[PDB]
Amino acid sequence: DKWASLWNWFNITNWLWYIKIEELKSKIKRIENEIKRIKK
Amino acid sequence: DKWASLWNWFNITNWLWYIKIEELKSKIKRIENEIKRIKK
Amino acid sequence: ELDKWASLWNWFNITNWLWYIKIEELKSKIKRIENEIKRIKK
Numbered sequence: 001d002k003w004a005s006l007w008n009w010f011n012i013t014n015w016l017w018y019i020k021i022e023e024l025k026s027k028i029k030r031i032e033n034e035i036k037r038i039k040k
Numbered sequence: 041d042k043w044a045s046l047w048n049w050f051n052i053t054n055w056l057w058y059i060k061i062e063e064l065k066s067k068i069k070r071i072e073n074e075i076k077r078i079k080k
Numbered sequence: 081e082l083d084k085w086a087s088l089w090n091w092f093n094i095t096n097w098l099w100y101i102k103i104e105e106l107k108s109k110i111k112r113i114e115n116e117i118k119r120i121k122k
Contacts, residue, residue: 002043003084006050010088013054014095020061021102027068028109034075035116042085050092061103067110071117 003081003088006043006047006088010050010092013050017057017099020065021099021106024061024065024068024106027072028106028113031068031071031075031113032109035113046085046089046092053092053096057099057103064103064106064110067114071110071113074117
């Protein structure tokens with residue numbers, strides 16, 4: 001039970017990191033594409 | 041105790057990571073705000 | 081019980097490491113962007 005609540009909490013946290021970071025990566029990628037486009 | 045200690049270690053690590061990621065996200069937000077201003 | 085404890089401890093350090101590598105790459109990319117923006121503005 002402690003194992004299982006802590007495992008659930010661990011997955012909840014990782015899901016939240018995953019989404020936050022994919023979004024950051026996505027925004028970073030759009031900025032890099034816009035700068036490349038500018039310099040074209 | 042061993043479960044409580046793991047919970048604590050995980051929460052402390054997660055908080056410190058949280059602070060650091062919000063700082064990246066702000067740098068991104070500022071760059072976005074600035075590109076938007078340039079394209080105006 | 082201990083074995084589960086160890087699994088969760090190992091999963092937390094492996095995932096924490098994988099995120100570390102990931103975020104370091106991102107901090108690099110942001111720095112490159114900021115420096116490029118300062119260069120253009122100078």
